[PDB]
Design an enzyme around this catalytic site. Sequence first.
Site, mmCIF file in Angstrom:
data_model
loop_
_atom_site.group_PDB
_atom_site.id
_atom_site.type_symbol
_atom_site.label_atom_id
_atom_site.label_comp_id
_atom_site.label_asym_id
_atom_site.label_seq_id
_atom_site.Cartn_x
_atom_site.Cartn_y
_atom_site.Cartn_z
ATOM 1 C CB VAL B 128 -1.023 0.012 1.205
ATOM 2 C CG1 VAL B 128 -1.758 1.342 1.316
ATOM 3 C CG2 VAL B 128 -2.036 -1.135 1.101
ATOM 4 N N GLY B 136 -7.037 0.981 7.145
ATOM 5 C CA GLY B 136 -7.843 -0.187 6.809
ATOM 6 C C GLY B 136 -7.795 -0.697 5.387
ATOM 7 N N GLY B 138 -5.005 -1.925 3.590
ATOM 8 C CA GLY B 138 -4.207 -3.141 3.533
ATOM 9 C C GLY B 138 -4.994 -4.359 3.976
ATOM 10 C CG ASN B 165 7.970 -4.689 7.707
ATOM 11 O OD1 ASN B 165 7.393 -3.696 8.202
ATOM 12 N ND2 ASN B 165 7.703 -5.100 6.489
ATOM 13 C CG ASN B 167 5.223 -0.397 11.600
ATOM 14 O OD1 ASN B 167 5.070 -0.296 12.828
ATOM 15 N ND2 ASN B 167 5.984 0.463 10.921
ATOM 16 C CE1 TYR B 172 0.962 -9.456 6.084
ATOM 17 C CE2 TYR B 172 3.237 -9.448 6.869
ATOM 18 C CZ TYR B 172 2.311 -9.210 5.864
ATOM 19 O OH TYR B 172 2.713 -8.799 4.619
HETATM 20 C C1 LIG Z 1 1.904 -3.806 5.833
HETATM 21 C C2 LIG Z 1 0.853 -3.092 4.956
HETATM 22 C C3 LIG Z 1 0.619 -3.915 3.670
HETATM 23 C C4 LIG Z 1 -0.536 -3.073 5.765
HETATM 24 O O1 LIG Z 1 -1.426 -2.216 5.169
HETATM 25 P P1 LIG Z 1 -2.196 -0.853 5.952
HETATM 26 O O2 LIG Z 1 -3.000 -0.254 4.847
HETATM 27 O O3 LIG Z 1 -1.047 -0.113 6.552
HETATM 28 O O4 LIG Z 1 -3.077 -1.697 6.922
HETATM 29 P P2 LIG Z 1 -4.370 -1.428 7.842
HETATM 30 O O5 LIG Z 1 -4.459 0.060 7.796
HETATM 31 O O6 LIG Z 1 -5.443 -2.363 7.400
HETATM 32 O O7 LIG Z 1 -3.729 -1.955 9.261
HETATM 33 C C5 LIG Z 1 -2.705 -1.380 9.964
HETATM 34 C C6 LIG Z 1 -3.237 -1.000 11.385
HETATM 35 O O8 LIG Z 1 -4.145 0.104 11.334
HETATM 36 C C7 LIG Z 1 -5.270 -0.192 12.130
HETATM 37 N N1 LIG Z 1 -6.389 0.596 11.544
HETATM 38 C C8 LIG Z 1 -7.041 0.284 10.340
HETATM 39 N N2 LIG Z 1 -8.064 1.107 10.037
HETATM 40 C C9 LIG Z 1 -8.059 2.030 11.067
HETATM 41 C C10 LIG Z 1 -8.878 3.146 11.344
HETATM 42 N N3 LIG Z 1 -9.879 3.491 10.449
HETATM 43 N N4 LIG Z 1 -8.701 3.904 12.481
HETATM 44 C C11 LIG Z 1 -7.670 3.485 13.343
HETATM 45 N N5 LIG Z 1 -6.810 2.452 13.206
HETATM 46 C C12 LIG Z 1 -7.028 1.718 12.036
HETATM 47 C C13 LIG Z 1 -5.479 -1.778 12.068
HETATM 48 O O9 LIG Z 1 -6.280 -2.230 13.122
HETATM 49 C C14 LIG Z 1 -3.920 -2.176 12.165
HETATM 50 O O10 LIG Z 1 -3.560 -2.160 13.460
HETATM 51 P P3 LIG Z 1 -2.446 -3.420 14.134
HETATM 52 O O11 LIG Z 1 -1.266 -3.145 13.225
HETATM 53 O O12 LIG Z 1 -2.269 -2.953 15.567
HETATM 54 O O13 LIG Z 1 -3.304 -4.651 13.974
HETATM 55 C C15 LIG Z 1 1.322 -1.572 4.699
HETATM 56 O O14 LIG Z 1 1.506 -0.799 5.888
HETATM 57 C C16 LIG Z 1 2.520 -1.508 3.757
HETATM 58 O O15 LIG Z 1 2.401 -1.523 2.538
HETATM 59 N N6 LIG Z 1 3.808 -1.404 4.394
HETATM 60 C C17 LIG Z 1 5.094 -1.338 3.725
HETATM 61 C C18 LIG Z 1 5.326 -2.656 2.919
HETATM 62 C C19 LIG Z 1 5.299 -3.880 3.816
HETATM 63 O O16 LIG Z 1 5.615 -3.945 5.011
HETATM 64 N N7 LIG Z 1 4.878 -5.003 3.126
HETATM 65 C C20 LIG Z 1 4.786 -6.324 3.727
HETATM 66 C C21 LIG Z 1 5.622 -7.300 2.848
HETATM 67 S S1 LIG Z 1 5.630 -8.915 3.684
HETATM 68 NA NA NA Z 2 8.815 -7.534 4.822
#
Ligand SMILES: CC(C)(COP(=O)(O)OP(=O)(O)OC[C@H]1O[C@@H](n2cnc3c(N)ncnc32)[C@H](O)[C@@H]1OP(=O)(O)O)[C@@H](O)C(=O)NCCC(=O)NCCS
Ligand code: NA
Lengths: 202, 198
Positions: B128, B136, B138, B165, B167, B172
Amino acid sequence: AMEGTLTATVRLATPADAPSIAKLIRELADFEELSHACVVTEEKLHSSLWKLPPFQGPTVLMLEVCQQHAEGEVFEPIVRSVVLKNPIDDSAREGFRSPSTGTHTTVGFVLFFPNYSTFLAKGGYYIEDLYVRKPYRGTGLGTILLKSVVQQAKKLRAGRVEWCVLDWNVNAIKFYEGLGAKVMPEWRICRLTGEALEACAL
Amino acid sequence: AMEGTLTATVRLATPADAPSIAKLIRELADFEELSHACVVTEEKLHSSLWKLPPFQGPTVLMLEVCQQEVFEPIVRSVVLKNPIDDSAREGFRSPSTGTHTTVGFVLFFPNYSTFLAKGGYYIEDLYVRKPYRGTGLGTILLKSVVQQAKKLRAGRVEWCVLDWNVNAIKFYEGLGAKVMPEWRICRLTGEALEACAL
Ligand SMILES: CC(C)(COP(=O)(O)OP(=O)(O)OC[C@H]1O[C@@H](n2cnc3c(N)ncnc32)[C@H](O)[C@@H]1OP(=O)(O)O)[C@@H](O)C(=O)NCCC(=O)NCCS
Ligand code: NA
Ligand SMILES: CC(C)(COP(=O)(O)OP(=O)(O)OC[C@H]1O[C@@H](n2cnc3c(N)ncnc32)[C@H](O)[C@@H]1OP(=O)(O)O)[C@@H](O)C(=O)NCCC(=O)NCCS
Ligand SMILES: N[C@@H](CCCC[NH3+])C(=O)O
Ligand SMILES: N[C@@H](CCCC[NH3+])C(=O)O
Ligand code: NA
């Protein structure tokens, strides 16, 4: 007892190999201290394997031993002579008779399938399982089996050949490193299964 | 730029998505501290993807947003955690609908468990864009893959993560995945792979 020189054969598995594959998967799970997690059956292998062409989905290669072609064939069996490190005593010999040739003993298997690297933007191969029965280890048979997979992967222009190892399995790590593979310490495997997988919903 | 509620769309990628997929793979490689090892091109994606039916080989789902069939697009309303400032917006216009901005992608393919004697799915890439993280999006993208995997009776859905990583690890674990510390990935590539002979 098997002595002197063996003839080792690496060939594509056929549905007739499902009984031996099931026994070898169970032996591997027992080695990995993961017997409780292993629920393999001949029926489950018939439902999931031999559905797609070899090398286009989950594919098994059988390793067999015994005491010593037209165009477009998918996998011509690999036949190699192996001078025995030590004479082999195999009490399980009769339960591992090969369905291809009655004179051959099934001693191992490998299951692999295509994978994909986005950084290379190229398909590769992933090895799920690699197993050699205990009396046949340490004499070069596992090298022939792994190298047969790699040779096929390279013919199919694979960017990488990958697999996983248990951090405590030092003999496998030494074996893989000796063949040029690098154990990558930074990566961790994540698994979503069972109730957590069932609960995961939009 | 974007405030209140967004409409998020998860859909199958087509060859027209190769430019955005290439751009996003590079952003991910940069995040994973592996930029120099990333050699992706649009041409390489055209040669390796869209060759097999979806979910039968390497498959991409695109994640796109706008201000409010083998695979029917997943459409969800997303209440924004905070307003989004996206300076890269014009460079990520969706080829499917001009009013949509591409914000992420996921690549996955079938895998197989011998212990279950059942096929599953393996997620290669999940990404993302930075302005759209933590709101929300991801979760929707990963859950879209899982929903498709479950429809296809997957025994497991698996992927890997860098140990540092934290975060992604938290994200996950919060979805029910277990990080298994005992397994190590082995790789035979480059010169090592070329030198492997029989
Ligand atoms: C890891 C990744 C794919 C997750 O996607 P995201 O869009 O960040 O994910 P979400 O927003 O669904 O979730 C992240 C957190 O936000 C929280 N959140 C989601 N919607 C929310 C909202 N509306 N208000 C408050 N908190 C919220 C979730 O509960 C989660 O919390 P946790 O981490 O304590 O469980 C993203 O951060 C990314 O691309 N990171 C860099 C690349 C990476 O790490 N890739 C993984 C390769 S293995
Ligand atoms: Na990773
Ligand atoms: C790991 C495994 C597949 C390797 O197969 P093997 O048949 O035991 O392997 P080989 O005999 O080719 O090689 C093992 C060693 O024998 C050595 N060797 C090979 N031929 C030899 C010979 N004729 N004389 C003496 N030594 C020999 C190799 O150099 C290697 O040494 P290294 O480990 O220090 O590099 C096997 O031991 C096995 O099935 N183990 C249990 C399951 C397991 O660990 N699976 C891994 C899944 S991740
Ligand atoms: N896509 C990367 C691996 C990332 C794995 C974790 N998502 C590669 O091709 O090397
Ligand atoms: N085949 C095992 C994993 C072993 C991985 C290492 N060879 C399973 O289905 O869980
Ligand atoms: Na192991």
